[PDB]
Design a protein around this ligand. Structure first.
Ligand SMILES: Cc1cc(N)c2ccccc2n1
Ligand SMILES: Cc1cc(N)c2ccccc2n1
Lengths: 276, 276
DNA sequence: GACCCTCCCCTTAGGGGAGGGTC
DNA sequence: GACCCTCCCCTTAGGGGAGGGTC
């Protein structure tokens, strides 16, 4: 009243950066009442300070500045609706996070399983919770020529639903007394889901289906072309010896141990199978 | 296996932009296995595709890329903890929104009151819910020289707690048969709070206190220097006529109607007072 | 001494464009 | 024809810096 405010003065009492203000001047969001054409100084009336209440608030909810310009104009009738807009926008940014917390929280649950694990190369027998998965016909792939490009479509579907990618790759094959590895080929190959959001439009060549709750003879180890077969052998034997009775395929699960493109690639296999 | 992937090829099956990949090459986050020194083409092995699982996932939770570099290196023991990091980070980005939804939702509740309001210039008598506020000693300000710079400290406190600014300015003064306006000066001046988050460190010269639930003779109108006094008059009269009995100060509340720096400034006053 | 000014280079994570050179 | 390349200008909302000119 009866004098102007310098930008310092405004900044201080309005709690807003000098550089901030200058920018708002620049974009024609908030201009000083008067610019000294001699010194180019910016001066501000007490009246206009009120405009900042909005600019501040709108900022704190993080609406864009170009958006604020369209905002300040409209009067209350509409300003309400606008807020109601933000309100919904929030509730969704909020539904999105609430998803993540769950996803991460489960993804974690699954790494712990990997780490805290009885012992390698031996055949543990244990009780497992069910695991939801997306499957597909193997169309004659084997461990010899399987290839993670082979997973692309499943991945496209998972990532659209989970936003995470599967951090394990699976296949299944019939339990036989296999005498070689070239003897074996996969039946239907698969990857775990984490989310219950619909797969947007599932084609009839994926299959949503599960690895069921039940008793599993399973062996787990780090990968090497050689050990792969030999550990499988341990398994076949373990059953035959104990005269156990299988009721599924063998489920095989490849998991990376690090994603560093610098250390030499290292994978952890798990091969499970259901028995009574 | 036994051939490379072109960037197109990778992009398609990994569902990631060609431009995206090129960038990851540029930052040394994800390099092609091999660059043709003749054509500068980028070629990729099937092996390395696995690195994208992380890069993709990490992206979807929106960790920075420079941060991803530090991530891929560490092995599971730590990768867990890292996630546990994100987990907490989310829960807070989430506590922040959950605040907003509430804040906006109440801020809205209060605009509706403004709009849906019985009638202007007349004296309505009504029942009011309590309103929490921050007060301060008026130190001799009147409607004549009051000035919204006068509000700066309260605002600094509110904005630190609510993140919104008060979109109304208040004062109180003693109920007298005032014969002029120069006769009047404010007692303790104030602004509404919306949040229950502590004011970080409140100085002993603010006061958290309320406008209490109770019966209010109140009049509301658009502002003009002139009407201000005259509407107040209506009020004093209304009481005196009905022989009512006041139990508070008059509470006065200035609210902007638009924040457009283009339309001429327009404010809505409300003056309330408590009676039995 | 304290305050304000106008350039000017920078920070994410790429998208959209030329304009060649190869599939 | 289809695919890939390397510059190059751009998008938020300013912060941090010169290097003058005024308080
Ligand atoms: C990515 C991947 C997935 C498999 N299931 C696999 C099996 C045997 C050997 C190499 C393999 N690679
Ligand atoms: C910002 C503001 C706040 C008030 N309470 C007020 C009172 C009378 C006249 C002008 C005023 N301006």
């Amino acid at each position: 009243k009866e004098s102007y405010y310098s930008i310092g003065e405004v900044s201080k009492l309005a709690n807003v950066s000098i550089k901030a203000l200058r920018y708002y001047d620049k974009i024609d969001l908030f201009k000083p009442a008067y610019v000294d054409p001699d010194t180019s100084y910016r001066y501000y009336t007490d009246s206009q300070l009120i405009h900042l209440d909005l600019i501040k608030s709108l900022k704190y909810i993080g609406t864009p500045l170009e958006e604020m310009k369209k905002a300040q104009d409209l009067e209350m009738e509409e300003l309400f609706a606008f807020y109601t807009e933000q309100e919904r926008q929030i509730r969704e940014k909020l539904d999105f996070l609430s998803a993540l917390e769950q996803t991460i929280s489960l993804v974690k649950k699954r790494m712990k399983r990997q780490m805290e694990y009885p012992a390698l190369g031996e055949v543990f027998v244990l009780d497992e919770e069910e695991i939801r998965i997306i499957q597909t016909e193997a169309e004659g792939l084997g461990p010899e020529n399987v290839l993670n490009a082979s997973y692309s479509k499943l991945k496209k579907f998972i990532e659209s639903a989970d936003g995470f990618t599967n951090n394990s790759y699976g296949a299944t094959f019939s339990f036989q007394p296999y005498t070689s590895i070239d003897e074996m080929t996969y039946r239907h190959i698969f990857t775990p889901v984490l989310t219950n959001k619909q797969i947007s439009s599932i084609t009839p060549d994926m299959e949503i289906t599960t690895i069921p709750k039940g008793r599993y003879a399973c062996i787990a180890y780090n990968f090497s072309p050689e050990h792969y077969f030999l550990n499988l052998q341990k398994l076949i034997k373990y059953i035959a010896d104990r005269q156990l009775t299988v009721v599924s395929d063998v489920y095989e699960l490849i998991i990376p141990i690090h994603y560093s493109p610098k250390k030499q690639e290292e994978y952890r296999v798990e091969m499970k199978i259901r028995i009574l």
